[PDB]
């Protein structure tokens, strides 16, 4: 039945850890750092969206044309299929047109 009978062990969150005690340090490296850097180039993560936002279709196009020659074969086929589908959907399906 959709409910439990024993309280889970109470999670201990250390609100004063390292990665919580500095969240945002150097998040203003430009306005007061002579504009040498940009916060864009502080955010770790994928090479194809270091500082970029788009919908799913644009994101997968960027993934293809920026890292789509180093990615494994089956993944690449899935990705091309995904582009084909999202093209069909975004361009021929919906209420507004």
């Amino acid at each position: 039945i959709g409910i439990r009978l024993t309280l889970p062990p109470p999670k201990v969150v250390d609100r004063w850890n390292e990665k919580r005690a500095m969240f945002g340090v150097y998040d203003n490296i430009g306005i007061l750092g002579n504009f040498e850097k940009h916060p864009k180039e502080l955010i770790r993560g994928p090479i194809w969206l270091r500082g970029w936002k788009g919908n799913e279709l644009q994101r997968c196009i960027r993934k293809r044309k920026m890292v789509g020659s180093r990615m494994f074969a089956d993944d690449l086929h899935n990705l091309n299929k995904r582009i084909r589908y999202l093209y069909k959907h975004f361009n021929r399906h919906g209420k507004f047109r």
């Binding site: 959709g2 409910i3 439990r4 009978l5 024993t6 309280l7 889970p8």
Partner: protein, 275 residues
């Protein structure tokens, strides 16, 4: 496992609710649950009823014998209550009898004494006391307190009221609590007698009048198993009561009860008590 914490706590509260509706704990004295300071509660008891006791007297009015003996026994590891209680019961019987004599003049002393000892009986006094929060403050050795210690304590409270603020105020106290309890209660539900027609002839002879002659006023369904017989008592061609029943004999008896009520001025159409 569904990750989360709200439903677990709601379910724990529901299960503790069910478990405390199934196996309720042994009832314990309200002076051992949390949120209890005695002095404030006594003063609030005083103010609730719209009286101004003497706090020392009202404290002495709850120190029963049993608690004193038990505490004395435990001291191996204080005034008493009998005085105030005895004064209280004395005044209660006197003033209740005076009230009922004033309001009801045509009743014998046996009926008046029965009504008095009913309105100071164990059951009714216990009802009033329980619905006046007296046993919460009562000191005894066993909870729930037995009706005996409870009755004694309620009359000890009335005694302290007397000795603090006068017979007239105490009279209105008794009027407000005890004398009210005979509202709705018919007479013979309070004065348990048997063989009514005997007391009827006794009373009518004490008034120098013939033993009353009974006849059959109304009759419907004589043969069946649901009959209605109306029996009318008479006093020499004039009628003093009638009554219904399912036998002519029960009809006789209840017409006797009706006539006995009418003579004693205790019918259901009487002027209500004037508060």
């Amino acid at each position: 496992v569904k990750k989360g914490f709200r439903a677990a706590f709601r379910f724990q509260k529901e299960l503790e609710r069910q478990r405390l509706l199934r196996c309720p704990p042994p009832p314990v004295r309200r002076s051992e649950k949390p949120n209890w300071d005695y002095h404030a509660e006594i003063q609030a008891f005083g103010h609730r009823l719209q009286e101004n006791f003497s706090l020392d007297l009202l404290k002495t009015a709850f120190v029963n014998s049993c608690y004193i003996k038990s505490e004395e026994a435990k001291r191996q590891q204080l005034k008493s209550n009998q005085e105030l209680s005895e004064q209280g019961t004395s005044f209660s019987q006197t003033c209740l009898t005076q009230f009922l004599e004033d309001e009801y003049p045509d009743m014998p002393t046996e009926g008046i004494k029965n009504l008095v000892d009913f309105l100071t009986g164990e059951e009714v006094v216990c009802h009033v006391a329980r619905n006046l929060a007296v046993e919460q403050l009562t000191l005894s050795e066993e909870f729930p307190v037995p009706p005996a210690v409870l009755q004694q304590t309620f009359f000890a409270v009335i005694g302290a009221l007397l000795q603090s603020s006068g017979p007239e105020r105490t009279a209105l106290f008794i009027r407000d609590f005890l004398i009210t309890q005979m509202t709705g209660k018919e007479l013979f539900e309070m004065w348990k007698i048997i063989n009514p027609m005997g007391l009827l002839v006794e009373e009518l002879k004490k008034r120098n009048v013939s033993a009353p002659e009974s006849r059959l006023t109304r009759q419907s369904g004589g043969t069946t198993a649901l009959p209605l017989y109306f029996v009318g008592l008479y006093c020499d061609k004039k009628l003093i009561a009638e009554g219904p029943g399912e036998t002519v004999l029960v009809a006789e008896e209840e017409a006797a009860r009706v006539a006995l009520r009418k003579l004693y001025g205790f019918t259901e159409n009487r002027r209500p008590w004037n508060y």
